[PDB]
Design a protein around this ligand. Sequence first.
Ligand SMILES: Nc1ncnc2c1ncn2[C@@H]1O[C@H](COP(=O)(O)OP(=O)(O)OP(O)(O)=S)[C@@H](O)[C@H]1O
Ligand SMILES: Nc1ncnc2c1ncn2[C@@H]1O[C@H](COP(=O)(O)OP(=O)(O)OP(O)(O)=S)[C@@H](O)[C@H]1O
Ligand SMILES: Nc1ncnc2c1ncn2[C@@H]1O[C@H](COP(=O)(O)OP(=O)(O)OP(O)(O)=S)[C@@H](O)[C@H]1O
Ligand SMILES: Nc1ncnc2c1ncn2[C@@H]1O[C@H](COP(=O)(O)OP(=O)(O)OP(O)(O)=S)[C@@H](O)[C@H]1O
Ligand SMILES: Nc1ncnc2c1ncn2[C@@H]1O[C@H](COP(=O)(O)OP(=O)(O)O)[C@@H](O)[C@H]1O
Ligand SMILES: [Mg+2]
Ligand SMILES: [Mg+2]
Ligand SMILES: [Mg+2]
Ligand SMILES: [Mg+2]
Lengths: 315, 322, 328, 338, 482
Amino acid sequence: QLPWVEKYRPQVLSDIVGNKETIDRLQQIAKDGNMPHMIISGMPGIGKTTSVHCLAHELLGRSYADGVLELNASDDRGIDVVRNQIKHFAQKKLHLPPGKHKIVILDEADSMTAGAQQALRRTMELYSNSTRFAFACNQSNKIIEPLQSRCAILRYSKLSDEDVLKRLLQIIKLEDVKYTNDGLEAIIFTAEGDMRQAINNLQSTVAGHGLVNADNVFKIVDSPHPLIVKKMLLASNLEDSIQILRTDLWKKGYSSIDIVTTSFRVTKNLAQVKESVRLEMIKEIGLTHMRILEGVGTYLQLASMLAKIHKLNNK
Amino acid sequence: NLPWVEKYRPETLDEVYGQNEVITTVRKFVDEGKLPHLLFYGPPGTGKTSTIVALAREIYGKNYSNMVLELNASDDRGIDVVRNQIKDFASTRQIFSKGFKLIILDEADAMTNAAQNALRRVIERYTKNTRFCVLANYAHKLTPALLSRCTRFRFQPLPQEAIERRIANVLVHEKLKLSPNAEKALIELSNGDMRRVLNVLQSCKATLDNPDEDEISDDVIYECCGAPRPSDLKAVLKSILEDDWGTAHYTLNKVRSAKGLALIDLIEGIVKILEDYELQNEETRVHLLTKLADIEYSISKGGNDQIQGSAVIGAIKASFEN
Amino acid sequence: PWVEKYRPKNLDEVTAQDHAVTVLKKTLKSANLPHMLFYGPPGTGKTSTILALTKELYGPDLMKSRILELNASDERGISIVREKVKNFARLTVSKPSKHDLENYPCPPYKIIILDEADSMTADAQSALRRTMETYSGVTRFCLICNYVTRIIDPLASRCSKFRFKALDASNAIDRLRFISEQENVKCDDGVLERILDISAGDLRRGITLLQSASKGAQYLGDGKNITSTQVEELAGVVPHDILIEIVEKVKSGDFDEIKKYVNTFMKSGWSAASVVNQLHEYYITNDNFDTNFKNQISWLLFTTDSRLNNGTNEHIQLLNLLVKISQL
Amino acid sequence: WVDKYRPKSLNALSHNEELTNFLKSLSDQPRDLPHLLLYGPNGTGKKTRCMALLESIFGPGVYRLKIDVRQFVTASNRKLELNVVSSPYHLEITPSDMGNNDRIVIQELLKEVAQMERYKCVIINEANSLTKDAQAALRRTMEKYSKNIRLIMVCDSMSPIIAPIKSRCLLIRCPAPSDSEISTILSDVVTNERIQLETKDILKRIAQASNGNLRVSLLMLESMALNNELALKSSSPIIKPDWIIVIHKLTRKIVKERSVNSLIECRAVLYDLLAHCIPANIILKELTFSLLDVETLNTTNKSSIIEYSSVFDERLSLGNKAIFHLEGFIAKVMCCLD
Amino acid sequence: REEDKLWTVKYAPTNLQQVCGNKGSVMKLKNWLANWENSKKNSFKHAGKDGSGVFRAAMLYGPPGIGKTTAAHLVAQELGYDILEQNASDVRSKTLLNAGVKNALDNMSVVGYFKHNEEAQNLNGKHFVIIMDEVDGMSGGDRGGVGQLAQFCRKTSTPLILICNERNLPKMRPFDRVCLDIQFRRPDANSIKSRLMTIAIREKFKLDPNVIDRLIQTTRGDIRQVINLLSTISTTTKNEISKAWEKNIALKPFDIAHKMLDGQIYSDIGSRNFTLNDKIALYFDDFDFTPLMIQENYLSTRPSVLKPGQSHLEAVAEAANCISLGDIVEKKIRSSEQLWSLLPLHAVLSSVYPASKVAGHMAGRINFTAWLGQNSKSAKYYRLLQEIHYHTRLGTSTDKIGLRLDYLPTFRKRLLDPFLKQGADAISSVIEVMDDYYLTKEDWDSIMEFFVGPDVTTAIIKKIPATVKSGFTRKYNSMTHP
Ligand SMILES: Nc1ncnc2c1ncn2[C@@H]1O[C@H](COP(=O)(O)OP(=O)(O)OP(O)(O)=S)[C@@H](O)[C@H]1O
Ligand SMILES: Nc1ncnc2c1ncn2[C@@H]1O[C@H](COP(=O)(O)OP(=O)(O)OP(O)(O)=S)[C@@H](O)[C@H]1O
Ligand SMILES: Nc1ncnc2c1ncn2[C@@H]1O[C@H](COP(=O)(O)OP(=O)(O)OP(O)(O)=S)[C@@H](O)[C@H]1O
Ligand SMILES: Nc1ncnc2c1ncn2[C@@H]1O[C@H](COP(=O)(O)OP(=O)(O)OP(O)(O)=S)[C@@H](O)[C@H]1O
Ligand SMILES: Nc1ncnc2c1ncn2[C@@H]1O[C@H](COP(=O)(O)OP(=O)(O)O)[C@@H](O)[C@H]1O
Ligand SMILES: [Mg+2]
Ligand SMILES: [Mg+2]
Ligand SMILES: [Mg+2]
Ligand SMILES: [Mg+2]
């Protein structure tokens, strides 16, 4: 076996589908050569590490093995490491083309201690002629102010439905798997902008049931079906909604967090009802979510959420 | 003298009940030799740990102690242990092994974001030389990157058949007699948790059996585990509904004091009883559910219990006027 | 303190909880005393009965040599439970003298009391499991706690569970009368039940309150009976006269008068939030208000309590509650 | 000025004769002093009462104190340098600088102080800012060290205090001084400083304007005595702090003009007030208690303003950006008054 | 080379007339380093007309990237001195400082000697300027570094310049009186605009003066940041148009706010062309700045989606209620980092709902959020108030908050007020008063700094002559109570 999130990883900067302007800027940087220190921030699973990896590859060509120092969460990143190894790598002699430079790729920089990030300022400022730093973090708020001041911030937005759909189309074209539009829509729904999670769910569905159909996708994701959730959030009488929640969703052992998240994601795409009622139902669902997350996942909370949703949909 | 929670533990795969859907799949997986990282998540008292230890035993034979690394919750694992111990165990090659090593983390949902990132990176780096298994009670508390690396398996609580079969088995290996309504009370109070059943059974065995042959009634099983009683619940409900304020308040205080019950159990039982009533107005149900959920959320933060009890009484009374 | 001069030293002096003392009295005559898991509210008689059992089974000579007391206050880390507690569990029992054998049956095991088991680390209890089970022949434990959920299940199987019920207001009056007689403290008529109601459940609070109030009234050198007012003034509760003043002001009045009165109250009056609880008790126990009134009174009091339970400002919430309860 | 005439002994305290009598009655047992919890509004003289009971029990050398700074370390490498005011017989702990080490510094520091040595006094200033875990640690400390530590905890409105602490100390309250008793203290001060008082109505005016705050009354008397050349006449422009005037102007702007264009200036004033070391709850108080005193409003408007203030106070206690809740409350007030 | 370098390096200052902003602090540092020789000749006892003739060490501090290190290095290199620089990337422990730098305290440079010593250029070329940079960054791997550096701030024979970011931090306490601490502030917008215009005219590209001001607003005064962000336009090659670069990557939050505040999206026709999911995804384009921008400019729009009977004020009140709720959600999110799933709820409660409530046309121009500047100002002032309370706790016996609400109005009447009417002979009384409370000149400024409202003291302070201030400064440096 081989994970499809690892076999179909983009190795060139052009294969990455997503934010077009940032990718164009990175392509121009790789074509020119003058690359500055950069912090890449964004949500998980939208191609942050892969982006800087393809950037370093296209920049260094055959020198990736000698002019790239990658540090992830597995390696030790303390005071001694930053003071010794990074410093000795920055001063390391290397003959490169006039535009290229050495690259230090620090993945998950938001996990590095403040003291360790402190000892990198002068290291990255004094050796700016032969060393360029590339940090990759999920939260740009945990990086100290001098570091954020020294490098340019590149924000990555969540993936739209069209780009994920095109990537899945390319994957199924190259993999020769049978599918339907309903299964693709279900995968886009359950992926909520996570390309890696989308590819993983597609591979799981293919390996489990072969045919990519909405039923198989919602069976392998082990989440409440959006159809029955929409039926619960649109009943005319509150009694039928409570019965649907009791017999069909609560008896099957579904987690309250999963039920609330599915109701949230269904109310967002419920194009039938108006905008104000959608926003208010989303507010109520989020209040119920906050109540559940605070240590009380009682069925009474979901019952009250349904009661409020019904009262708001009737008023 | 070993506990029934530990004595009746399934030592192999065929002795876990109510989880056939996952048992057949894991059997096929260990028979095809394509065992990936497994994320066993679900409510407690279901059989995750027993299933995984039985699988590890069936795979490794006598090499269990040398080829299986059992790791637990926080245990002072800030960033150090996941960085050194797990990494070495995944990197250290055994001396006479033909295969891969297994590291099983129990209730690993309590790890911090940095620890979860370190763990997922370790899994990514050594996915070819070892396999990982993570146990969890809530799959939402884990980083969405760790989920996309392994295969998930939800452990839906045991149905009635598995629990009654296990009650039969524990009655075979122990001289106890159980009343027909005793097993009904047990399955109603268990909520599909075998651990609590095996905990409550030994307690009643220890306390009640003077000649080791008595009959366990609903009274003792309700008293030991500290659970409400349906008759008492209905009496409190009727007293709140029909009688006036002084009498209903006094009855509620007497019930919640002379038996040692908490307001959370009273509220959930009251709403469970009210679920099936044929009330005329729907605004009644709306107000009832809203106010009861508000009272429960406020109780969750530890207020003055008398005030929330009076508020429960007032809400129940004021909702039934339409 | 009178809580120490009059602590129960024998198993008969404890009269509040009787359902647990009788079975241990039946069992002490046998050397198979299992490990114990006592759970219950604070100030019910846990340590009293524990020390009483220890005293009546071992005697004053061996109180220190073979009975250990460890609390949450002292260090109890994994290192301690693996070095000190473990060695004390494996140390051979001492030789009791002939005087002890002549008055007390010396059991072939030790007594280690680790009270307050709620706030123990899971690592510590998981280690103490094996620290306790393998040495059951020469060591037995008794863990004290308030909530059974804090201790892990394997530490509750071998240990028999004992719930110390909250003492009732009917059997606790005799002990208060007893402690009143053994000290020649002159009390008034209707004060004992007020002390019991103020310190409901926790009899220790009532004992300390009575002691402190008697000692504070003795300084006056009057020798008069100790009234209910000087008792309720040390518990932090709002007096009844100012409470009646608040109720009369809120029964019929304008916004300005209520605001000025609550300003004066927060300025110089009692600065406790128990006024809400007293208003709750008064309005609910009263028999001159209608049902539609009680509904809204209870709801408003619950809302005010939920607001005040978030570290908010007392003055604003109290004024809002008073205005809302006046608008009805 | 205010600190120069502060009574440094129980015999010099000229307020709350009953409380001073109780303190002199308690100070006849230097060996068995029970734990003590003082509560009452600010500016009443409870810290003065503690530092005077200590002077009456111990020697007069308790006032000559020195401040030390000690570093403590948490699980990680965060070293925090907490400051402690120590005396040859007592020390003071103010848990207002740490937010999470409340259970880490106390249970250790007390653990340290009861081992060198006839007890020692630990004054826990602002005993209400302690999270329940710190309160449990302090209860454990009171339980274990009873022969060496005597806790005198100062606080106000002791509602967020657990029962294990309440039931183990003497609960003493300090009511605010009456105006007839604040005027006396102001008279002693103006006599000791040869101030030319034309009549006695100035002292009553200051007492009524300070709302029982004794130290604020003395301080505003000082502030008004340095502006009239130490000659306080009947034409007395009662001095208000630099922020109360701004809050009153903001209230008047709220009452006069109710629109968004004025809400912009209201938010600007809130920005000017917040960044200059002023908490959120103080602003919310001084705005609500100043919007209810306007005579141009009726009962319904005030009854809605107090409800909105009670809601937004709870909302402030559950957030981190105070300007958001303040602007929301101001917008609700504007919408209701219209 | 010429192009492989960065822009913050190739356009770094070379003299002291190119450093934009903070002319007073640079001039003070230069005049101190110059008169250092005469001060050493006078045994550091005679205050040389400014009170800076007694201080052995200078301490530079301020916001990041404003010119501290650059100005220090340039001042050291202009007077002919030799620089010995040590940074956070070196192990500054107690023993290493005792061995490495301590021995070089009173020596002469072999580099400065063998470089040039024959021509009569300056007699201090054989000396040391010891630049301890990033003093606030000494982590747990540097035990005793602060105490040893404070001891080195005295008992020295060469200029010792300390650089940090937050001076009022409790860690930097031992540097209370032993070092001359001058404050570098955020440079004015005009100097940054002039520097950016010079960089642009040297780089052969023209920018709209509005984009420059908006960049200055989003950067909050960081000059290195504006240089790094200006080095990004060079990527846009393949004109007379650069709207894409500004609206997409650099100035993204402004475009996000402009798109979210458009009333045409929430109309019935536009609701289906741009659904709710599109707005929730628009939020995720930048989730760290969108709520702040929304809260900043949600009440400066002319609405067109009002209800039949709902005015502007009620809609604004409802939007502010939703903003408060979203702030509560944001606090819950950022209080526990494993709650990444609450992001869409915070998006709806903070950005989507208020925008949908008060959408419409933009009255004026979209301004950057002002909460960041006020938050930094409030943090700095909290640090200042704590540093003040640490020096007066011995005689006040009040909480750290009570010192500001009550005691500072009277301190104004006692400290600053006499200077207005009495002239210049009340310095003794003010010095006595501040000595009774262990106060200093920096503490005097910090006290006289807050005073918001009708009691603003900045105009009054700048109104007094320079002679009285200089006299008070050089007179306080002689008498010391503690
Ligand atoms: N824009 C994209 N186009 C194509 N494939 C993508 C894209 N983004 C992600 N992927 C796929 O997702 C896989 C994993 O994405 P990563 O870049 O490793 O995640 P990430 O961006 O680093 O976020 P983290 O590491 O969880 S914080 C890649 O190997 C790709 O196969
Ligand atoms: N399916 C089952 N069949 C029989 N006994 C079971 C079953 N599940 C649990 N038990 C009993 O309960 C004990 C504890 O089970 P565990 O596997 O530890 O529970 P779990 O699913 O791992 O969830 P935890 O441990 O509470 S996080 C076992 O030793 C058995 O005695
Ligand atoms: N039944 C009782 N009869 C007489 N005195 C009692 C009784 N219960 C408690 N007391 C008194 O209250 C004191 C409380 O002692 P403990 O046994 O420690 O109570 P507790 O329940 O352990 O409280 P904790 O430690 O907070 S759980 C005793 O020392 C007695 O003075
Ligand atoms: N006033 C200024 N005029 C022009 N460029 C400046 C100015 N201040 C800073 N810079 C630029 O910023 C770069 C680095 O500035 P530094 O002064 O080294 O930063 P810093 O003040 O040390 O703040 P730290 O150390 O990062 S917290 C210089 O090389 C210049 O390109
Ligand atoms: N008996 C008294 N006579 C004169 N002044 C007093 C008396 N008691 C207290 N004070 C004044 O109160 C001030 C101390 O207030 P403090 O106790 O710090 O306020 P808080 O009660 O908020 O802690 C002193 O400056 C002193 O002038
Ligand atoms: Mg990555
Ligand atoms: Mg298990
Ligand atoms: Mg006890
Ligand atoms: Mg620098």
